[PDB]
A paper describes a structure:
We identified 107 proteins related to Apyc1 present in phage genomes and also found many closely related bacterial proteins encoded in diverse bacterial orders. Similar to SBSphiJ Apyc1, closely related phage and bacterial Apyc1-like proteins cleaved cyclic mononucleotides with broad specificity. The observation of Apyc1 homologues encoded in bacteria may be explained by the presence of cryptic prophages present in bacterial genomes, but also raises the intriguing possibility that host Apyc1 enzymes may play a role in regulating Pycsar defence or other cNMP-based signalling systems.
The cyclic oligonucleotide-based antiphage signalling system (CBASS) and the pyrimidine cyclase system for antiphage resistance (Pycsar) are antiphage defence systems in diverse bacteria that use cyclic nucleotide signals to induce cell death and prevent viral propagation. Here we show that phages encode anti-CBASS (Acb) and anti-Pycsar (Apyc) proteins that counteract defence by specifically degrading cyclic nucleotide signals that activate host immunity. Using a biochemical screen of 57 phages in Escherichia coli and Bacillus subtilis, we discover Acb1 from phage T4 and Apyc1 from phage SBSphiJ as founding members of distinct families of immune evasion proteins. We confirmed the critical role for Apyc1 metal-coordinating residues and identified E74 and Y112 from the opposing protomer as further catalytic residues required for cCMP hydrolysis and release of the reaction product 5′-CMP. Together, these findings demonstrate that Acb1 and Apyc1 constitute separate families of immune evasion proteins and explain the distinct reaction mechanisms that degrade CBASS or Pycsar cyclic nucleotide signals.
Residue numbers in the entry:
A (entry chain B): 3 to 248
B (entry chain A): 1 to 248
């Protein structure tokens, strides 16, 4: 599979768009998260939203859901196209009821539910989902905001995508040796102290063999200050297409 | 009575060359941001305006180009600045703005953050009443037609400037504004493409008498705006980030 980050930034970064990933596999294009910046980032990249076969949501924050409304309106009224919206089962209801409904509800046109704007595909956690031949997604519950459901993803039993995620030393080391992944893309908070995101200092406590697997994402505007100061880890370059083999 | 307005963005909801149509109003030392869309934090950053300099935000309706930036404001004001600013909301929108839009991302029950008032001083505004939100600065809401069945508002500022926000064309209301004395200036939603649905179009606005056109600057416009410079009758287009001054 290939991944191109349409943004690599933390939630309020001004030099980097929202941390949202364009995944390409066997002709399918999956957008992981769809923040307030996602339409602008795709437009800058020259990717029409009609080229997105599905959007998968990992948790409810503006840098992950705040672009869905623009997608929904343009796909309905300009293109007349239905794409898939993959939502963790626990987030299906709040994503509409408490986030998207305000702007997207249009009772007088019969648009009362999220399914009126997308083919909504609820994904149970801890089950492998083949969303396209050769492309599998497995949700892993992450810790981000206590009491709010958020997920990491294992892609093609090959790439672990943390999304927003507190540091879990034992889980990451177990990923390195269980064979379940060869690559890790991990949330990286550059400022101290550690609250709801893994910090660079925390990630630097990992063994070198795990660091060799890791590229860093969801980072703030001072990222350039830490180039060459991230151990054996590397920062993902915004808009670069990476290829992940095996 | 006098006030200034600087549009931090002048674009329609998906314009890629203009930020969301959100207005920075300056009056007697108070800074009011009218609407706070997905682009508002980036536009303020580009202008060098810290969000700590915003005394209040007023919301005219619930769409992402008007409310999608509030979450960032709320988080930064709470966790970085420890500051409370005012959030002015039409009374009919107070509940849905939280319940159906902002709650998903901002609710944090384990920290005791269960309502919009935990992130702002929420000030509910009844329509058709004049509100003095700061000495010398008054706002009067006027129900607009935008999405049928959804509450949306235009605003009269300082009994001087009519700010349409998102608004279908209303010939009689605009001509009445031009002659009643209730305003001297109109800032109006302008859709450049045909046909008209939920926004006034340029062709509709060009049916207004010349005397009313002379009162109007155009906003909330799409990326083709530059093709229409010099082709808007006696109206003209608001320039993004220009500070306009309104008097008398
Ligand atoms: Zn995030
Ligand atoms: Zn988050
Ligand atoms: Zn709008
Ligand atoms: Zn609108």
């Amino acid at each position: 599979l290939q991944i191109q980050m349409i943004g690599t930034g933390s939630a309020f970064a001004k030099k980097f768009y929202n941390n949202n990933a364009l995944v390409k596999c066997n002709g399918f294009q999956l957008l992981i998260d769809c923040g307030v910046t996602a339409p602008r980032a795709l437009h800058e990249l020259g990717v029409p939203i009609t080229g997105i076969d599905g959007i998968l949501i990992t948790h409810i924050h503006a840098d992950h859901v705040g672009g869905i409304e623009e997608f929904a309106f343009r796909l309905k009224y300009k293109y007349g196209m239905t794409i898939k919206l993959f939502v963790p089962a626990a987030l299906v209801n709040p994503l509409w009821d408490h986030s998207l409904r305000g702007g997207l509800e249009n009772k007088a046109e019969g648009l009362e539910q999220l399914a009126d704007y997308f083919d909504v595909v609820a994904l149970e956690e801890a089950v492998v989902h083949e969303i396209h031949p050769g492309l599998t997604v497995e949700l892993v519950r992450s810790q981000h905001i206590a009491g709010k459901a958020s997920y990491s993803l294992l892609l093609n039993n090959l790439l672990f995508y943390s999304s927003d995620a507190r540091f879990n030393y034992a889980q990451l080391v177990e990923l390195s040796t269980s064979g379940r992944c060869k690559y890790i893309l991990h949330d990286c908070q550059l400022a101290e102290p550690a609250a709801v995101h893994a910090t660079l200092n925390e990630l630097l406590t990992l063994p070198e063999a795990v660091q060799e697997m890791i590229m860093l994402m969801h980072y703030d505007d001072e990222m350039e200050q830490f180039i060459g100061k991230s151990g054996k880890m590397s920062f993902m370059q915004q808009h670069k297409t990476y290829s992940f083999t095996e």
